[PDB]
């Protein structure tokens, strides 16, 4: 099991703890502080919810997470079928072990505690000097806003449905409830092209005018509805406005070079997410050591 | 020594947070009396020192005082808004220190009103002082009286509320000794806002008198020992303020009070706990639990501080890296430089 | 230099002149330190006593 | 009603125009009065073989 290349766990390790926190990360952190227009406020509402996660719940979250991936590793090579030549006898000692070992496992105490300080200085950094670096952020932000956004778009379609044309093609008729939201969600539309920069947040006097609309074309829909599609809507529209702020973002590493604060191509996010890139590269390699070396004695010893 | 810096963290803490917010989560000592039940005698008893006003069955305290016992080489008290000291080791500065108290309760007193909400921190010095942070109400008062204002009643029962709102504070009830639990609103009050009783401390006065008045043993062991009364107490204390006069030595009291308690049959017959009697006793055990909450709290509040600390700074290098923060008569003086250069430039 | 002495002398006009996010934040920091300074005088003394 | 009101600003200020409340209001009258006398003319023409 330590015959293998580093490579291989760095990518795993990589890969498995970016899923386990990409939704906290972004939803509970960035969504909040995305809302607001001053960049100064923004940054500062970043650095206070990653203190706060880091301090508590990081260090779990990476041993949780470094365990996993030694466990599956260690019981697939456990119970990997050896083609016809596999014996069968000793596979149900090797289960009973493993599951007895597993309890008995236990990580170091010590290592939440350093590794707190090691991420908390890696993350301190804010000066990206390889363009290269920069390139590599912005492609990390398209995998992960593609994700988000194909996720928004399935909910869409549930809500809507296919397209005129594509339910055309696929003979597929809406429902009664699907047209009333396709209908609610081309109010919302000229809403959101007229006020481009409208808040998140809903007010009652909006819900009127809308339902007044609504009733204009002879629809009848309750306010907790409009709401709901609104919060779609506008999270669709949100990452499509990250998306068009990625590709302006793509040229402006030059403007960046020179410390133009006051050009208004202000790559807070792209910093933010190379940050993070390059944290997570610094645990899965600082994970992958202490596996290599830390735990393998304890593994033999509770043998 | 210490508690000095306590007092002082927790007067600069309320003029920074005008709200108990923060306030309220600091250990504190709240002391509510009634009309001629010794208040301030047990106060005085504490503070080895009679310091406030005295009156023959007058409210003298028509302002809350924030009286702080200290380490000093000295037994004086010193105002926080004066440097001019007092000894406390005189009698005359003794009169003296009362009357200037007298003053500033009216002094304070705002217009429309006999009793002001505002409090003075006053800091007690002596040698062998327990270290811990007092607080002075006025009586509690069944009937209005008609020199006072009409909401004075209203002000003491508000204070009194937003002392106990902290719910570290440690609640400490003044009653006398010859009057019944049912025929006195504040110790009603205070089960009521602690159901818990996790933080209550009562303490009954004239304890000698009530002895001279033939009580009824199994109720003053029902109190001693929380059993007539519903609430459950860390303990009870009693302690005697003398003859009532207004007159009489601390020392003089506190020696009877010794002396009193030796001879009393009650004691001796194993009635009431030898331990849950005396000043000194009731004393060292406020001091030691009022110590280890706020060691546990001012923990907490230091990291909080710190933290909070770091994000203004944070925030600052985000909005202003390159420039230097400077307080109001600072700026004012840059202010004038920039102008002094306009007018030559 | 008239005019400057006798604003210097009242600190409420200054109050009512001086408002802004860099006045607040600057006087908040300079309360919340000087607390903290006291609040680590206070720890330190006390630990120090055992 | 003033809801009403509040719909109509919005869909001027989607036209960059800024118009004060007393000013629909004077408009909505006059319109309502055209609009129903071009009614009772369309009852006039039903009604005149009723």
Not at chain 2, 161 to 190: H, W
Request: with cysteine; charged share 30%.
């Amino acid at each position: 099991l330590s015959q293998v290349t580093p490579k291989h766990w760095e990518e795993i390790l990589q890969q498995s703890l970016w899923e386990r926190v990409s939704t906290h990360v972004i939803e509970n952190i960035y969504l909040p502080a995305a809302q607001t227009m001053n960049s100064g406020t923004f940054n500062t509402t970043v650095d206070i919810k990653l203190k706060q996660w880091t301090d508590k719940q990081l260090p779990n979250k990476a041993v949780e997470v470094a365990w996993e991936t030694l466990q599956e590793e260690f019981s697939r090579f456990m119970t990997e079928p050896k083609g016809k030549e596999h014996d069968d006898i000793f596979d149900k000692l090797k289960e009973a072990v493993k599951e007895e070992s597993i309890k008995r496992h236990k990580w170091n105490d010590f290592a939440e505690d350093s590794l707190r300080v090691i991420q908390h200085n890696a993350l301190e950094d804010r000066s990206i000097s390889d363009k290269q670096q920069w390139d590599a952020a912005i492609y990390f932000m398209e995998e992960a806003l593609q994700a988000r956004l194909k996720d928004t778009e399935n909910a869409i379609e549930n809500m809507v449905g296919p397209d005129w044309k594509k339910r055309w093609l696929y003979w597929k008729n809406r429902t009664q409830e699907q047209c009333v939201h396709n209908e609610t969600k081309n109010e919302l539309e000229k809403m959101l092209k007229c006020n481009e920069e409208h808040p998140a947040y809903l007010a009652s006097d909006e819900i009127t005018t809308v339902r007044k609309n609504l009733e204009s074309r002879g629809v009848e829909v309750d306010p907790s509805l409009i709401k709901d599609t609104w919060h779609q809507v506008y999270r669709r529209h949100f990452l499509k406005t990250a998306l068009n702020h990625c590709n302006l973002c793509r040229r402006g590493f030059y403007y960046y070079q020179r410390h133009f604060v006051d050009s208004e191509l202000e790559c807070n996010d792209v910093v933010l997410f190379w940050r993070i890139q390059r944290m997570l590269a610094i645990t899965a390699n600082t994970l992958r050591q202490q596996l290599t070396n830390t735990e393998v004695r304890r593994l033999e010893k509770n043998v | 020594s210490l508690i000095d810096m306590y007092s002082e963290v927790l007067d600069v803490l309320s003029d920074y947070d005008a709200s108990y917010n923060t306030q309220d989560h600091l250990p504190r000592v709240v002391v509510v009396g009634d009309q001629s039940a010794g208040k301030t005698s047990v106060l005085e008893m504490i503070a080895q020192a009679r310091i406030f006003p005295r009156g023959s069955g007058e409210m003298m305290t028509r302002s809350p005082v924030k009286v702080t016992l200290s380490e000093g080489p000295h037994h004086v008290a010193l105002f926080k808004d004066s440097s001019r000291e007092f000894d406390l080791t005189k009698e005359e500065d003794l009169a003296a220190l009362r009357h200037e108290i007298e003053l500033r309760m009216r002094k304070n007193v705002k217009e429309g009103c006999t009793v002001s909400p505002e409090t003075i921190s006053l800091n007690v010095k002596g040698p062998g002082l327990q270290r811990m942070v007092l607080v002075d109400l006025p009586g509690v008062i069944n009937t209005v009286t008609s020199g006072m204002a009409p909401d004075t009643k209203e002000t003491i029962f508000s204070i009194s509320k937003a002392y106990m709102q902290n719910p570290n504070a440690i609640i400490l009830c003044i009653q006398d000794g010859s009057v019944d639990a049912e025929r006195s609103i504040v110790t009603d009050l205070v089960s009521q806002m602690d159901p818990h009783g996790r933080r209550t401390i009562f303490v009954l006065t004239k304890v000698d008198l009530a002895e001279k008045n033939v009580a009824s043993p199994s109720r003053i062991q029902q109190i001693i020992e929380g059993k007539l009364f519903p609430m459950k107490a860390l303990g009870y204390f009693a302690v005697v303020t003398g003859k009532g006069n207004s007159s009489e030595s601390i020392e003089a009291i506190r020696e009877y009070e010794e002396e009193f308690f030796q001879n009393s049959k009650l004691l001796k017959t194993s009635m009431l706990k030898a331990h849950q009697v005396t000043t000194r006793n009731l004393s060292l055990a406020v001091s030691d639990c009022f110590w280890k909450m706020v060691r546990e709290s001012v923990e907490q509040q230091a990291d909080s501080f710190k933290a909070t600390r770091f994000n203004l700074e944070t925030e600052w290098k985000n909005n202003y890296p390159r420039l230097r923060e400077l307080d109001r008569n600072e700026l004012f003086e840059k202010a004038k430089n920039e102008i002094l250069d306009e007018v030559i430039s | 230099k008239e005019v400057l002495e006798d604003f210097a002398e009242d600190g409420e006009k200054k109050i009512k002149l001086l408002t802004g996010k860099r006045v607040q934040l600057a006087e908040d920091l300079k309360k919340v330190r000087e607390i903290q300074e006291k609040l680590d005088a206070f720890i330190e003394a006390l630990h120090q006593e055992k």
